[PDB]
Amino acid sequence: TSILDIRQGPKEPFRDYVDRFYKTLRAEQSQEVKNWMTETLLVQNANPDCKTILKALGPGATLEEMMTACQGV
Amino acid sequence: TSILDIRQGPKEPFRDYVDRFYKTLRAEQSQEVKNWMTETLLVQNANPDCKTILKALGPGATLEEMMTACQGV
């Protein structure tokens, strides 16, 4: 599993979810999670007009691509 | 400013927002943003019942506190 895949169940004790979360998080490579982190925040904090184009780019877009797509707004 | 405070305006060119974002991000301490990152994901991915208590704890709760509060679900 990837870190973004770990959902807690609704019959799963919270400590058991937290342990799953963290085993996965540790097996994730620090640099991957970091960029996913920071891009997620960057998109989430962009104005409503840009934010649209940004999500309409699908997963994994580069910063260059993000900025290319938002020209003129 | 903190990283979580950088909102893009609706008259702000996207490249200018991205530059603000990143100057702030760089001035943030790596360890702070990381924990904020990972707790945010952990909360966001918790079941609807737990997730409630977790947000009802307010900003900055410890993992210990998070798990303490979710006992029995």
Joined together, the tokens standing for residue B4 give 């979580």
How far is A9 from A13, CA to CA, in rounded Å?
8
Question: With an 8 Å Cβ cutoff, is B50 touching chain A?
Answer: yes
Instruction: Please tell me which of the candidates B7, B17, B47 has its beta carbon nearest to residue A8.
Output: B47
Query: Which of A48, A63, A53, A3 lies closest to A28 in space, CA to CA?
Result: A3
| B6 CB-near residues (< 8 Å, 6+ apart) | A45, B17, B20, B21, B24
Asked whether the beta carbons of residue B73 and residue A14 sit closer than 8 angstroms, the reply is yes
Resolution (A): 2.4
Phi-psi region of B58 (alpha: psi -120 to 50; beta: other; left: phi over 0): left
**Mutation to test the A interface, candidates B14, B22, B42, B43, most A Cβ within 10 Å:** B14
Asked whether the beta carbons of residue A14 and residue B42 sit closer than 8 angstroms, the reply is no
Instruction: Please tell me which of the candidates A33, A45, A48 has its beta carbon nearest to residue B6.
Output: A45
Q: Which CATH superfamily is domain B12-73 in?
A: Retrovirus capsid C-terminal domain (1.10.1200.30)
User: Residue B72 half-sphere exposure, CB side, CA atoms within 13 Å?
Assistant: 2
Query: Which of A34, A30, A19, A25 lies closest to A1 in space, CA to CA?
Result: A25
**Mutation to test the B interface, candidates A42, A71, A73, most B Cβ within 10 Å:** A42
Q: How far is CA B43 from the centre of its chain?
A: 9
